[PDB]
Design a protein around this nucleic acid. Structure first.
Length: 94
RNA sequence: CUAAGAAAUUCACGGCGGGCUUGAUGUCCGCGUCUACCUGGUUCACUGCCGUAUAGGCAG
């Protein structure tokens, strides 16, 4: 649905951009056994072929049921009351 | 416009016969190498996934 958020360009000391930033995008999910939910979306906005690089930042739109129905068990929570949600984003008409 | 501008060294050939280098010797004696660290950077193609032509069932 609409409820997609992007964070701004902050350096993260937990994720090295060396060998796994274009490999592990949906690998920790259970979509390879497919016992529960099966909806996941994979996208790549960034097609830039200059020199020895294709794709380096994260913007990958998943489904609508996965954040709402599959997350009845704690798997992505804990980071609830960190910041206040601001003005909402629109779904792009072009 | 250059101490400018020029240029054939060439032919031939037996180095070779012989030989005792020896004898002797104490290297010793002492010694604290230490402290720390993500190879989470691209560090050979190991027998059981239906056909280069853009075409086909990956509970790895």
């Amino acid at each position: 649905m609409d409820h997609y958020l992007d964070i701004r360009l902050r350096p993260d000391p937990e994720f090295p951009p060396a060998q796994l930033m274009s490999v592990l995008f949906g690998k920790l999910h259970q979509a390879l056994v497919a016992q529960g939910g099966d909806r996941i979306g994979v996208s790549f906005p960034d097609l830039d072929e200059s020199r020895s690089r294709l794709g380096e930042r994260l913007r990958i739109h998943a489904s609508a049921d996965d954040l709402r129905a599959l997350l009845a068990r704690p798997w992505l929570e804990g980071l609830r009351d960190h910041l206040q949600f601001g003005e909402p984003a629109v779904v792009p008409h072009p």
